[PDB]
Amino acid sequence: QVQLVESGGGLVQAGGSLRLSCAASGYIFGRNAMGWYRQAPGKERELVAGITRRGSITYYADSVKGRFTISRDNAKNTVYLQMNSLKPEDTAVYYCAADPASPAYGDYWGQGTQVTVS
Ligand SMILES: [Cl-]
C-alpha cells in the first residue's frame, strides 16, 4: 500500500546535472526523516544526503557537499535530489528511503534508479 517511486535518472555527461525525484503514495513525507542512498559499482550502499525529523536539518556526505541539494515539496508529496557538477564517481544506483510515521522495524524504500555519468 505504501509506495516510494523514484524517477529522473539516466545517462549524463561529466559536469552536467540531474534531478532525482521520490514520489510517495499511501504515505506522506511530511516532516518525517528520509534520505537518499547510492550504491556505486563494487561498493556498498552509502548514505548521500538526508533530512532529519528533529528540526528538519539537511546533511550531506562529504563527497557530495556543495554539489547536491535535497529538497522536499509538501504540496507534491515529493522529495528531490538535485545533482550538479556530476562526476564519473557519482555513477550508481540511487535510492530514497523514508521513516514511517509510526513504530516499525525498517524504512520505506524506493525501487532505485540508475544514474550514469560519462
Ligand atoms: Cl531525527
Numbering used by the authors: 1 to 118
Give passages from the manuscript.
S1 binds the host cell receptor angiotensin-converting enzyme 2 (ACE2), whereas S2 catalyzes fusion of the viral and host cell membranes. We isolated single-domain antibodies (nanobodies) that neutralize SARS-CoV-2 by screening a yeast surface-displayed library of >2 × 109 synthetic nanobody sequences for binders to the Spike ectodomain.
We further optimized the potency of Nb6 by selecting a saturation mutagenesis library targeting all three CDRs. We incorporated these mutations into Nb6 to generate matured Nb6 (mNb6), which binds with 500-fold increased affinity to SpikeS2P. mNb6 inhibits both pseudovirus and live SARS-CoV-2 infection with low nanomolar potency, a ~200-fold improvement compared with Nb6. An x-ray crystal structure of mNb6 alone revealed dramatic conformational differences in CDR1 and CDR3 between free and SpikeS2P-bound mNb6.
